Amino acid sequence: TTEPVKDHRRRRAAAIISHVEPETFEDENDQQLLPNMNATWVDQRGAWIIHVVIIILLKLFYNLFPGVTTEWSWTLTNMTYVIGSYVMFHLIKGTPFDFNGGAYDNLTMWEQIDDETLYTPSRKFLISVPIALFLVSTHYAHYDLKLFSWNCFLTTFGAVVPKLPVTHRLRISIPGITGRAQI
Amino acid sequence: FGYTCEQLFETMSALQKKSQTNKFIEPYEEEEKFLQSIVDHALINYNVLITRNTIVLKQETLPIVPSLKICCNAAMSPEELKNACESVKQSILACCQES
Amino acid sequence: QHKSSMVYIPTTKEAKRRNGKSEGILNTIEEVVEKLYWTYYIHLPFYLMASFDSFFLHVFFLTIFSL
Amino acid sequence: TRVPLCEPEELPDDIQKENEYGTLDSPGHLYQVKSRHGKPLPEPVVDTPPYYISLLTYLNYLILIILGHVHDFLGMTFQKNKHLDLLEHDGLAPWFSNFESFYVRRIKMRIDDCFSRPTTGVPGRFIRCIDRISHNINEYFTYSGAVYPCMNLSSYNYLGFAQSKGQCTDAALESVDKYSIQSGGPRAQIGTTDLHIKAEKLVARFIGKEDALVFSMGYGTNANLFNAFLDKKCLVISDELNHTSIRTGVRLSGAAVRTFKHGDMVGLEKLIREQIVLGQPKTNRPWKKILICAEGLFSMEGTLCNLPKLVELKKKYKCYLFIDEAHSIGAMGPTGRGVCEIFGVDPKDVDILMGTFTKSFGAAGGYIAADQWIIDRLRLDLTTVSYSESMPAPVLAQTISSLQTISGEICPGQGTERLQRIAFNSRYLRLALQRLGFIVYGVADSPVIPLLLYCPSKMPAFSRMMLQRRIAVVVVAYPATPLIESRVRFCMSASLTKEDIDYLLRHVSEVGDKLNLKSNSGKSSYDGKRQRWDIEEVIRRTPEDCKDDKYFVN
Ligand SMILES: C[C@@H]1CC[C@@]2(OC1)O[C@H]1C[C@H]3[C@@H]4CC=C5C[C@@H](OCCC(CO[C@H]6O[C@H](CO)[C@@H](O[C@H]7O[C@H](CO)[C@@H](O)[C@H](O)[C@H]7O)[C@H](O)[C@H]6O)CO[C@H]6O[C@H](CO)[C@@H](O[C@H]7O[C@H](CO)[C@@H](O)[C@H](O)[C@H]7O)[C@H](O)[C@H]6O)CC[C@]5(C)[C@H]4CC[C@]3(C)[C@H]1[C@@H]2C
Ligand SMILES: CCCCCCCCCCCCCCCCCCCCCCCCCC(=O)N[C@@H](CO)[C@H](O)[C@H](O)CCCCCCCCCCCCCC
16 A cells, blocks of 8 residues: 555554553644643642531532431432543543644543652642542441442442552453454 | 756755755756856847746745746847847757767 | 923813812712722623623522522 | 724924834933853742632632533523524534633623723834724624724733834835835745845844754744654653743644743752653653753743753753743843843853744844754755745835844944833833832842732723723733732833823822722742831832842842
């Protein structure tokens, strides 16, 4: 076939388990030219207490309705926080603002945090907060293992599992359940 | 001059890929000097001014060779244009001769 | 000085003091209401929203207070 | 449904002259700046607001982001016929997808009335604006053909050279009469005249270099300058707050890019050392050259760069220096030479100096100055010179007239009065605003005075309320700025007088009291005490005390 002079073609995965290919020289220059704005706001002033305030308000609003049960209210607020965090961090790929070319079209925000540097204080805080919430919820009131097992399973697999370094730069594509991911 | 367009294109592409600071080619310079010689000869003898195509070779990516150009506008008269055409033809014929 | 073609808009205090609108008995309540309304309205997003959503959020806050 | 064409107004000469340029009141309202002689530049200090403001900002942005996606999803899923722009008709993709235009449609659209405003006439100290009415939600406008004057604090005329009656206008008209408005072509075959060389030599002498070049556009100058001498094997070290034109030029050049934090020199030195040691990627061979790009004065912050430290570093580590100064070539300095005059640095230390005429001289274009053996090579290696159109005659005449006026040749004592007036106005406004209780940025002399508004919904209220008072201002926000910090940028000019500033101070004080915009701490006053002065006392005491160079923290 005819070969292009300059080729920038997106390639998709071809296996159940796969990893994203490391970037090139031109892509590295494009990312280094302009600071990223999706990952800068996490380290700024007043960006840590906000999660605590959100948790406090979610507890109060879910407890406000008379018909709710304390175990049910805490499970529902866990639902809200875990789903919101998963949607914001791990679900959406890309940048709302336009960068040069495709740029950060393949990585998520959690991967973009602090220029892919691991073991940063913000990451430690973001991984420690859900754990503290889980232990506080468990110790606060009476519980039965029935919903407890599923709640801890969701806490582990929706908040803890994605944060491990083993899952960094990792993509899973089921042949039919999940669409193919660009590598 | 003993050179062809394809050889010049290959030389320029290789030099650009190799990232050499110094990019100098002799036959291109000789051809440009020759064309400027036609321009000057046409200017000194007769009050007619023409120009050649001014390009930067080290920035181009596609094949291109030096050339010459003549422009015209809507305020001229046919007789002067015909006289200028005859003059430039005579200049080109005189310069290209003596082979 | 020299005159120009500019039309100067008087400030609120000057207009109020030249209008005789200020009345001690029946203006402090109005000023308090104005302050309470503006402080509530400015620091929270109602001003970049749509009418339906703004009304919905007003009803949400009103119900939260009423409960 | 269409912008009407406004008939010019017929007025006597004196009224129009007063509208364009204002006469001085008292000779005590002037200030002459003094050189620094090279004493060190201290690290800047920034004030901060309380926590609850930031918390409210975070909640506001979170709610806006959630609701935007809710509306987008519902509308795209159900009402397809309404949104035909974002769907493929017949095997053709749309011009743009929904995702990249999210910020423009969802949050910016509600504020489109405060961004683009048509005007007419010469922009002086009073600008005439066209009246318009909004329909739907800023989708289209209807115009009634009515005009009204406003005070302008948003136009780039620092020295007030934008006039319709003056020596520069006479020179422009004479040039139009002598030279036609048309040019020949690229400045390598036809299109060069004696005026071009005269402007070349005049600019070269004014700056202090040996030779120069003049171009018709500044953005094109920056976008085409870099590829002439840079290559894939070189390295470019630049700040994080540079202009877009430099970024485009570096992208076209193809070299490697490393960036350092704003105002940090320890990090810069560490980066230079590491980059020298490591070398090229994947081969670890030495770089061919290293270049440092910076800006003379930053418009978004109103702060200066520490030139002596850069010169010392480039001398010690054998590097090259490139300085971009378009906001500081005519408005700053004891005599207006630029950033090289206040610090006392010899002009020969910097390699390449660039600037534009748009901001201060009232004409469009740009230039570049360097040594003779560099300009001789560049006149051949540049692509702007041999491929693009040339600069017209009236613009050259206006630029020459402005430069000869500032230099003190054509008129004896007109430029110095302008410099003193602009300096005094900037100092007075900054000191009065800080004594009121607001938050400002700057270095006590920059013409840019950014006042900070933090809540997302306060900028449109401030803009509309200032418009109702017949004052024109410009407000910027995300992503052009950090998420938390929004601001309004004041551009002070020499044409404004002191009474205009008093009028502005009264109105802004009232509006800030209404909107709760003044929140100051003890880090902004020299005595360490938070200050809330009453307005008349400020007006009485500030203009005398603004001259002493001790009342300013930075
Ligand atoms: C009280 C009640 C409770 C319940 C409730 O209400 C309140 O709670 C409410 C709370 C709601 C959630 C809140 C927040 C979100 C996140 C949002 O996040 C989307 C952001 C993504 C895009 O999504 C938008 O755009 C999509 C475009 O396809 C729309 O999809 C189709 O929409 C229609 C069919 O559905 C049809 O028009 C079409 O079939 C098609 O347009 C979608 O609808 C729309 O949202 C951004 O990511 C992508 O960006 C690119 C897309 O441009 C992808 O392609 C790229 O791929 C390569 C990169 O790899 C590049 O190189 C290629 O160039 C390039 O092609 C890229 O792969 C991928 O990363 C998705 C929705 C969700 C979960 C909401 C759901 C509804 C609720 C549950 C409400 C609920 C009602
Ligand atoms: C019967 C009851 C059953 C209960 C069932 C419970 C269901 C739970 C439903 C959950 C609904 C909420 C899920 C998603 C809502 C939020 C998702 C937003 C993601 C939209 C796209 C994100 C793009 C990021 C780019 C961007 O603009 N970034 C940033 C700027 O550059 C961004 O604009 C700012 O920084 C603001 C974000 C900071 C605010 C703090 C959030 C942290 C805590 C998250 C908890 C969420 C709780 C929701 C109430």
